[PDB]
Amino acid sequence: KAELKGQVKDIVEESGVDTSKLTNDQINELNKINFSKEAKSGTQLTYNDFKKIAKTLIEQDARYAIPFFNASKIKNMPAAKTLDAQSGKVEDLEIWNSWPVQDAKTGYVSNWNGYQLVIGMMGVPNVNDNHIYLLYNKYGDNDFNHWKNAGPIFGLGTPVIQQWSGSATLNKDGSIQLYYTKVDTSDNNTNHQKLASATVYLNLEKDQDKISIAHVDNDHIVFEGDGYHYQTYDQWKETNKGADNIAMRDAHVIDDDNGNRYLVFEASTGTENYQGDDQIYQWLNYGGTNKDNLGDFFQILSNSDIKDRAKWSNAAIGIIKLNDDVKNPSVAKVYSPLISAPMVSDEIERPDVVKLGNKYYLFAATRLNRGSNDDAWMATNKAVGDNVAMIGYVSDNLTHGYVPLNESGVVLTASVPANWRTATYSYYAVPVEGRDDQLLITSYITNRGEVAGKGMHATWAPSFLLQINPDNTTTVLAKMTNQGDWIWDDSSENPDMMGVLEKDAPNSAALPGEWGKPVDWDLIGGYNLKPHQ
Ligand SMILES: OC[C@H]1O[C@@](CO)(O[C@H]2O[C@H](CO)[C@@H](O)[C@H](O)[C@H]2O)[C@@H](O)[C@@H]1O
Numbered sequence: 001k002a003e004l005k006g007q008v009k010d011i012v013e014e015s016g017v018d019t020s021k022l023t024n025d026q027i028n029e030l031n032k033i034n035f036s037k038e039a040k041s042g043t044q045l046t047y048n049d050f051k052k053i054a055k056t057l058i059e060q061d062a063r064y065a066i067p068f069f070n071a072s073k074i075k076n077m078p079a080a081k082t083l084d085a086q087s088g089k090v091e092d093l094e095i096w097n098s099w100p101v102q103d104a105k106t107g108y109v110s111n112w113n114g115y116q117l118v119i120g121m122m123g124v125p126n127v128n129d130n131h132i133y134l135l136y137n138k139y140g141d142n143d144f145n146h147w148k149n150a151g152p153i154f155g156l157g158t159p160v161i162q163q164w165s166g167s168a169t170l171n172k173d174g175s176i177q178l179y180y181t182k183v184d185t186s187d188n189n190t191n192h193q194k195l196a197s198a199t200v201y202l203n204l205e206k207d208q209d210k211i212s213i214a215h216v217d218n219d220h221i222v223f224e225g226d227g228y229h230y231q232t233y234d235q236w237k238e239t240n241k242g243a244d245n246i247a248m249r250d251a252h253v254i255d256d257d258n259g260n261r262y263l264v265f266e267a268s269t270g271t272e273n274y275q276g277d278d279q280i281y282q283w284l285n286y287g288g289t290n291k292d293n294l295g296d297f298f299q300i301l302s303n304s305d306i307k308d309r310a311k312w313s314n315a316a317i318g319i320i321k322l323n324d325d326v327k328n329p330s331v332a333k334v335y336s337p338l339i340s341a342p343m344v345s346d347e348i349e350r351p352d353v354v355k356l357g358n359k360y361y362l363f364a365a366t367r368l369n370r371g372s373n374d375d376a377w378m379a380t381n382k383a384v385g386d387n388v389a390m391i392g393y394v395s396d397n398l399t400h401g402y403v404p405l406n407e408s409g410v411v412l413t414a415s416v417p418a419n420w421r422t423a424t425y426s427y428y429a430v431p432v433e434g435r436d437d438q439l440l441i442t443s444y445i446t447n448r449g450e451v452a453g454k455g456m457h458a459t460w461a462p463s464f465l466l467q468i469n470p471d472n473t474t475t476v477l478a479k480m481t482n483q484g485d486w487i488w489d490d491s492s493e494n495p496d497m498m499g500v501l502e503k504d505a506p507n508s509a510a511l512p513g514e515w516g517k518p519v520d521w522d523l524i525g526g527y528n529l530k531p532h533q
């Protein structure tokens with residue numbers, strides 16, 4: 001019986017929608033929309049941003065598309081033939097999320113007694129086997145085969161206690177301060193994640209060029225969520241009706257110029273801007289033109305799966321200040337999210353803050369299929385056979401005021417199907433010494449679990465340069481390295497690592513047998529692919 005009331009009235013008219021042709025229920029829903037302009041949880045990844053990101057992906061623009069790799073050159077990591085944490089025996093592990101021991105202000109890969117040090121998740125494919133390992137090479141060395149493994153940081157283990165991604169920097173005494181995610185799986189196989197820290201001490205034998213783990217001290221939980229800014233495990237236990245992501249992970253250490261230390265990490269928003277049926281009616285979340293936003297509003301309302309995901313999406317990239325106890329830190333201060341995606345996504349991962357000149361750049365990896373807009377992400381699988389991207393923001397301040405790069409946030413987009421050898425994920429930008437406008441993008445290549453075939457293991461990708469423009473835009477550069485190079489310099493470039501999207505080229509991006517092979521059931525993988533321009 002009733003009618004449109006408040007600001008929504010103006011909105012419907014602007015749109016050119018015939019008010020009389022609105023059913024009774026429509027008007028009741030429309031009257032639920034809330035037009036508050038006050039942002040509750042930092043800069044947002046909006047429904048519109050998401051859609052644009054997906055569109056940019058489908059377009060395969062050379063500005064943002066992950067360069068093609070020469071598939072025939074990709075090999076499993078030799079240092080991955082190593083003692084496994086959950087069996088104590090030498091096995092063929094694969095290696096994924098990885099991070100260099102790096103300086104906390106500058107991000108530069110650290111030089112430890114002439115070695116570069118990287119810490120990474122490794123384990124046996126198709127086994128629940130998530131643990132972190134220390135890897136090392138001479139500093140500046142580019143040979144993938146020269147990396148060696150110093151073993152699991154915490155020794156032999158089980159799936160009850162796992163270690164997922166974080167970061168690492170050096171202490172003054174040359175120990176490593178490690179930030180990692182401790183995960184406890186005892187409560188009904190849930191991944192109960194906590195941000196943790198430990199001091200790792202190394203034994204070096206100069207004459208054998210061999211590093212070992214000597215002591216691991218001060219292992220403790222640093223942060224579990226506050227409940228207001230960030231969701232806690234308890235809050236998740238209550239609400240989670242099965243269809244909910246839990247996140248307290250991927251801590252990236254950064255220092256300001258005054259020597260304060262912060263961890264930037266992946267989480268979910270707490271009660272400050274919580275998930276729920278209400279998030280659908282927050283006009284703020286749409287971020288398009290009013291007309292656009294109204295189309296979106298209806299899409300969500302009529303598609304029950306989208307509506308469902310929308311209720312549950314509240315990914316956030318959080319930040320906390322640590323106290324001054326370097327080796328045994330506690331939380332000094334909890335801030336509001338740098339970025340959040342209420343209604344839009346339940347997963348933004350591996351955040352990374354690099355300070356370039358005077359601005360703070362924040363990047364994160366995402367899988368668009370964790371997004372709420374099925375029509376958006378199903379279309380990317382149809383185009384490219386993958387839905388991964390790296391998003392990015394810039395700010396004058398570490399702790400607030402982030403602004404999306406390239407309009408929507410997109411910085412990098414998936415360019416080959418997820419079950420190809422050359423599929424990539426877990427982008428991690430590393431700064432380049434004496435090039436303050438470029439970043440080295442590292443990642444891992446080949447998805448876990450042998451999706452690309454037996455013996456095809458997740459391994460370190462060739463790295464490639466990304467160009468940062470002061471006008472808040474980015475361009476992918478056609479400059480590529482050997483597999484597993486964390487340190488760009490002039491000797492680093494290896495153009496033979498570059499691929500082409502052609503079936504029979506010797507530097508094809510597809511291995512023999514991949515071009516046109518199925519992904520996600522029927523989708524002929526490679527059909528909708530096009531050259532980068
Ligand atoms: O139980 C979580 C744990 O299982 C593993 C190995 O069994 O997952 C593998 O199998 C999944 C499908 O059943 C894949 O989606 C997954 O990517 C693959 O690794 C572990 O990898 C995972 O940590």
Ligand SMILES: OC[C@H]1O[C@@](CO)(O[C@H]2O[C@H](CO)[C@@H](O)[C@H](O)[C@H]2O)[C@@H](O)[C@@H]1O
Pocket residue numbers: 097121130164165181249250347349350367426
């Ligand atoms: O292996 C855990 C590690 O990988 C990331 C992504 O690089 O998360 C992966 O594992 C989670 C559960 O196994 C998934 O929820 C997520 O989608 C998957 O990509 C990191 O965030 C995490 O530290």
Ligand SMILES: [Ca+2]
Pocket residue numbers: 244245268275312313314315346
């Ligand atoms: Ca959620």
Ligand SMILES: [Ca+2]
Pocket residue numbers: 140141142485486487488489491492
């Ligand atoms: Ca190098």
